[PDB]
Amino acid sequence: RTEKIICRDVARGYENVPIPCVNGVDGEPCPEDYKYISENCETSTMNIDRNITHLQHCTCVDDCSSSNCLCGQLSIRCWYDKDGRLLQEEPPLIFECNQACSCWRNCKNRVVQSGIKVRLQLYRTAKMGWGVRALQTIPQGTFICEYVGELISDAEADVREDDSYLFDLDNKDGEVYCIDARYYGNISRFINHLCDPNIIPVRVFMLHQDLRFPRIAFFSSRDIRTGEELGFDYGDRFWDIKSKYFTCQCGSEKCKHSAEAIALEQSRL
């Protein structure tokens, strides 16, 4: 079977680079049951707090590479190196520089807000439907893409029927919100769960600091080779609900969510 290119760019030119779609597995057409958006949307009143005087911000006159940058000090247990790659030492939290900072738009603390830089491809997997893979080598710590979708309350997320694209922001101070990528989403909605994952989600603040709405940035957790499928750990909560409908097909020797692994965890408990 010939792997045919079925969309030159599922993002319709909204990302820094195209994201083409191919299918060398079956006859499934390019997915169109959703609306591709490159930034989060709302379908009810969220009214994100963008008040420029609510932004914590730095006074740096350099490129924000010094530990004196307030925005880097606000970042929790993570930092960017000279090449824009994320290092880590309570989940991490990135405060990037913003429009209130004295610094320039190309300072060293602007990785996620500068967008996709790696070449990605939407492709048909053997067993998991559509997936996303790298078309280049990707060093550990590189920004990949943002989890983009429809902002909704936890109460709204609880009542939605198709929860296969629901990302819980897990707010700890205030009410809990979610990103639902079912009806509106970007390339991240197609990233599958892997028990041997190679990317990690990290909460980030950029042009607003409304604590209801951290934005979700995926970074590679190791060097990724050309052609490798991207995947992250969806988490135990996801599988505790979805394993009633399907079990994990990642096929890894490390797999923790197969029928066999679930049965073995139930006997271990």
Ligand X SMILES: Nc1ncnc2c1ncn2[C@@H]1O[C@H](C[C@@H](N)CC[C@H](N)C(=O)O)[C@@H](O)[C@H]1O
Ligand Y SMILES: CCCC[C@H](NC(=O)c1[nH]c2c(c1C)C(=O)CC(C)(C)C2)C(=O)Nc1ccccc1
Tell me, residue by residue from 90 to 129, as one string, x for binding to ligand X by CB under 6 A and - for no binding: --------------------------------------xx
Q: Are 191 and 229 in contact (CB under 8 A)?
A: no
The reply to whether 30 sits in an annotated binding site is no
Determine which residue in the list 14, 18, 84, 210 makes contact with Cl ion, applying CB under 5 A. 18
246: partner contacted, choices ligand Y, its own copies, ligand X, none (Cβ within 5-8 A by kind): ligand X
Q: Which of 249, 256, 260 is nearest to 126 (CA)?
A: 249
**235 makes contact with ligand X (CB under 6 A):** no
Q: Which of 245, 201, 252, 20 is nearest to 124 (CA)?
A: 20
Distance CA 142, CA 2 (A): 32
Footprint (CB under 6 A) of ligand Y, residues 102-161: none
CA dihedral 43, 45, 50, 54 (to 10 degrees): -140
- Minimum CB distance to ligand X, residue 133 (Å): 12
Q: Which tokens is 70 given?
A: 């307030």
Q: Single out the residue of 199, 219, 203, 200 nearest to residue 211, CA to CA.
A: 203
Contacts of 101 (CB under 8 A, 6+ apart): 57, 58, 59, 60, 64, 71, 107
Interface residue with its own copies, options 53, 67, 266, 267 (CB under 8 A): 53
One-character DSSP codes across 105-146: TTSSS-TGGG---S-EEEEE-SSSSEEEEESS-B-TT-EEEE
Encoded amino acid at 207, one letter = L
What residues form DSSP beta bridges with 22? 5, 123
Is 69 among the residues that bind Zn ion (CB under 5 A)? yes
x-or-dash string of contact with ligand X, 191-230, rule CB under 6 A: -xx-------------------------------------
Task: Please name the residue that has the structure tokens 């797999």.
Answer: 255
Q: Is the torsion defined by CA of 126, 129, 135, 136 positive or negative?
A: negative
Residue 106 near which of ligand Y, its own copies, Zn ion, none (CB within 5-8 Å, type-dependent): its own copies
Q: Which of 39, 164, 235, 236 binds ligand X (CB under 6 A)?
A: 164
Nearer to its own copies, 147 or 234 (CB): 147
**Which of its own copies, Zn ion, ligand Y, none binds 37 (CB below 5-8 Å, type-dependent)?**
its own copies
Q: Which does 35 bind (CB under 5 to 8 A by kind): its own copies, ligand Y, Zn ion, none?
A: its own copies
**Binding to its own copies by residue 37, rule CB under 8 A?**
yes
List interacting residues with Zn ion (CB under 5 A). Answer: 58, 60, 64, 69, 71, 97, 101, 103, 107, 109, 195, 248, 250, 255, 257
Binding site for its own copies (CB under 8 A): 9, 12-14, 35, 37-39, 41-53, 99-100, 102-106, 150, 184
Residue ranges for the known binding site for Zn(2+) are 58, 60, 64, 69, 71, 97, 101, 103, 107, 195, 248, 250, 255
